[PDB]
Amino acid sequence: APVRSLNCRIWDVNQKTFYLRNNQLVAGYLQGPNVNLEEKFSMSFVQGEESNDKIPVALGLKEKNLYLSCVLKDDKPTLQLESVDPKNYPKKKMEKRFVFNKIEINNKLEFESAQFPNWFLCTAMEADQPVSLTNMPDEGVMVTKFYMQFVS
16 A cells, blocks of 8 residues: 555645745745646655654645655755655655654644754745745744645
8 A cells, every 4th residue: 555645735824825935945935827836736645753743744846756854954954855766756665854743732733853953844924935844833923833734
């Protein structure tokens, strides 16, 4: 049995939506014809740590063979998009840099890096900036909560 995957839209609680720029994932207020730039996600339900509440997922940009991943860059956990080979990915046992623990509270989602615990997927308050990770979700004005809608 292949890994379970479902296509979805994910957007932040400030209503920013995701799109690609200069091959970085960015969040902004797409409007008019640009709304068609919105990137849908393939969410795969991967192997990860047993948990009462968290659900391990990998997040790929639909049909692009590009996965969100977490790596150290200048000694700081950092979000980067990694190209993957569709002959091998997604799969049940994905490498830990690709795994996020999906956390649902009040039907909003947070995505915690499994590689770097306590670092969460985030967007800036400013539009059209790269998506990032933060371990200080409750400082400043970064956004770490998301809505989602499965599509098909």
